[PDB]
Design a protein around this ligand. Structure first.
Ligand SMILES: N[C@@H](CCC(=O)N[C@@H](CS)C(=O)NCC(=O)O)C(=O)O
Ligand SMILES: N[C@@H](CCC(=O)N[C@@H](CS)C(=O)NCC(=O)O)C(=O)O
Lengths: 223, 223
């Protein structure tokens, strides 16, 4: 059985788990606990970190002995899984669209990552301002690109829908007014959540006990 | 002829231009000037920005009427060009390696972007400290991954070599001592610089007049 390793948070790994939930692929979830403040012990991870034969030892990792793969870096993992499960473009035209949206999703995600784990309120309010200021335009551009489509490239769901859904879900939880009346993207969120594999995952206890972030975060550190 | 549009800086578009220089592809370079301090007018860009039919209007863009493509997002552009010019993985094994390194290059790039365009000396010296503390390890990990190889997947160069070269070149110019744990990465820089198409591009006056960053930057704003 393949193994996915990560913290006990939604975090970076969320789009991967949604992809795996949608496809129904069996895998073992290996979870690493973070101890309480102020020491935030991560000893479980450090005990395996160097012992797993990883090139770039980090979480998440994806290992599948049978297929002979060992992968770190969320986007490399999710693209690997997309190719395996047929959740990629079936023409260059689709691939271009997927990859443009993919970079937009990554930018949103990495800006939020920096905001959520800000050191002091100073740093946090600075990035919050950036988010509230720049993101509305980016969500409008995404809505305009999605149009009347069900998913990014149209009728068929692809891996980027999971990346986009994840970061929009985080933003909705961070500041609802970014999307409260943002109608098309709300329908998009609803549509992807209603897919049976994702619905089953989101209604499971394992998901409901996951905070968005690790406990030291300024946002999302608890359920 | 395809068109590549960008500011008059190396910036995010450097790896694309290197890839195009290696492959010899003919293209028109459309450049947008930045007005002087303190307003940094970008009116040249705004005059075309909405008129180009781009989904996510931004710089860089790549347009090729004949092929019917219109692309923004640096990484989507470079992957498009990689597939066209055969600079991608030939197996899932190679692609996994390429994509792990790709994400590393992007992380380095986006961290440098935030440092280089810091608001004040305070913010700049804070982010400089983070780079001088975290980056040596990241360069060691990259060196270890490259091993005795010529390029990331071995004897054949691929698109990510251009992405990695570009960000290592910026780092070398930002803080040379960073490459004290990697003689191997300096060899990698030299090796790619020595390819005929790259040598021709880097010795051209068009490249020599390009600063790394736009003029408002704390680092790399002049030639
Ligand atoms: N939650 C963030 C990033 C998740 C993540 O992996 N963050 C790191 C901290 S920057 C973490 O969980 N660290 C756990 C630890 O090492 O204690 C996101 O959704 O982008
Ligand atoms: N060179 C930077 C990014 C280059 C870039 O495109 N920067 C922006 C500013 S954040 C720019 O040139 N825009 C022109 C402007 O400020 O109007 C990097 O290392 O990635």
């Amino acid at each position: 059985a393949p193994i996915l390793g990560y913290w006990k948070i939604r975090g970076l790994c969320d789009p991967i788990r949604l992809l795996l939930a949608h496809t129904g692929q069996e895998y073992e979830m290996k979870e690493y606990s973070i101890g309480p403040e102020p020491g935030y012990d991560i000893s479980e991870w450090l005990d395996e970190k160097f012992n797993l034969g990883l090139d770039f030892p980090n979480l998440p990792y994806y290992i599948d002995k049978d297929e002979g793969v060992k992968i770190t870096q969320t986007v490399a993992i999710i693209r690997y899984l997309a190719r395996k499960h047929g959740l990629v473009g079936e023409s260059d035209e689709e691939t271009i669209k997927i990859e443009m949206v993919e970079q937009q999703a990554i930018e949103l995600t990495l800006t939020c990552k920096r905001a959520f784990y800000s050191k002091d309120d100073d740093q946090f309010n600075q990035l919050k301002e950036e988010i509230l200021t720049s993101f509305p335009r980016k969500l409008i551009d995404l809505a305009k690109f999605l149009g009347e489509n069900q998913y990014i490239i149209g009728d068929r769901i692809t891996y980027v829908d999971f990346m986009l859904w994840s970061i929009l879900d985080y933003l909705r939880l961070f500041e609802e007014s970014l999307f409260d009346e943002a109608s098309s993207l709300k329908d998009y969120l609803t549509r992807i959540e209603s897919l049976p594999g994702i619905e089953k995952y989101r209604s499971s206890d394992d998901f409901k006990r996951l905070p968005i972030t690790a406990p030291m975060a300024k946002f999302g550190g608890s359920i």
